[PDB]
Design a protein around this ligand. Structure first.
Ligand code: BEF
Ligand code: BEF
Ligand SMILES: [Mg+2]
Ligand SMILES: [Mg+2]
Lengths: 209, 200
């Protein structure tokens, strides 16, 4: 069973690496390489791909990147198997990708064999989870907020935080007190499992909802 | 041409794989070692007759650091070594600080796949990559402040930022508060939003 593979990453050095690590796998065929999400979504309908190995952070205004792009691929190419290869190791981001029920997550900070092992497992209709992914996924699992989703109010505050506004600007913009905005903000944070402001913005750069 | 022994360092093994692939074409290149943190790199440099280092900017290593600290350490202890920095960092202040250290090349991970071969060829001729990027920046902060800001913005807590510089919690906190006021932000959140809009 040959597997036709599409690779997507905004760093061409990584694309070369992915091919370099896949050259030893005889049953893998690379039918396309893309560096932004517009080019990827445009070429998906014309290649007959079985698997996508995709990055999370990439350019592309039309279809975006991150969780948004992956959801989009799931809806419109449901038979396509997805493995995410990402440097974005924020537990909240990775738990969000795991929620999408794709065929694997691999970290660029992980082991050199993690990607070929993910593909090997997929050939056997199985899921490979590296330890490096498992560890920080258990942090969010254990804490116990994985089930909960954002309210419209919470989403509203965070969407403006995602365009770089401060708590005092959002209060004025939504016509709410600082106390209310902060309470809404911290409640949203507890749900997403992000413990500080840098973690929150990094989460917000990978989801646009 | 003259044969070059090359050492590669990056905390992402996929990138290390990619660099080998980019250089496998070049007859005169020989890769003599691959390292994923600055401690393994520095420990091994004297044992391998390295001529060129292709190094990442952000990598683990508390002992010799990363970034500017590492490059300075390498310049001082290995003056016969040529250094090419290969990085995803696209902050003008950081890059200008790296380019102040007189390295022999810079390649951005966003740039073309041929840039690395091309930077190697320029090392024989005695760099275009530094110039082009300097002009890209042309068309405020200190190197010590820049590095504190990098570490913070990359995801590292203030605690973690102490050990990579052997500066205390107070000294990194003070340079941060200085750099924040020096840039025009008064807030951690405003600090990341600034970094976005200054990006190359
Ligand atoms: F930019 Be990818 F998510 F490593
Ligand atoms: F982590 Be490197 F600076 F791309
Ligand atoms: Mg990327
Ligand atoms: Mg790195």
């Amino acid at each position: 069973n040959n597997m036709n593979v599409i690779i997507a990453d905004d760093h061409p050095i990584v694309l070369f690496g992915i091919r370099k690590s896949l050259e030893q796998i005889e049953w893998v065929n690379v039918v396309g390489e893309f560096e932004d999400s517009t080019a990827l979504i445009n070429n998906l309908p014309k290649l007959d791909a079985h698997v996508l190995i995709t990055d999370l952070s990439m350019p592309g205004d039309k279809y975006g990147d991150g969780i948004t792009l992956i959801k989009y691929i799931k809806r419109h190419f449901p038979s396509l198997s997805i493995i995410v290869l990402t440097m974005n190791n924020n537990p909240a981001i990775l738990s969000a990708v795991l929620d999408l029920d794709i065929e694997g997550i691999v970290l660029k900070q992980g082991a050199p064999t993690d990607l070929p092992k993910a593909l090997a497992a997929l050939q056997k209709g199985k899921k490979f989870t590296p330890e490096s992914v498992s560890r920080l996924l258990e942090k969010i699992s254990a804490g116990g907020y994985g089930d909960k989703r954002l309210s419209p109010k919470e989403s509203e505050v965070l969407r403006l935080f995602a365009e770089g506004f401060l708590v005092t600007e959002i209060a004025k913009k939504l016509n709410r007190s600082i106390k209310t905005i902060s309470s809404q903000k911290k409640s949203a944070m507890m749900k997403l499992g992000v413990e500080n402001d840098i973690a929150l913005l990094n989460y917000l750069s990978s989801v646009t909802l």
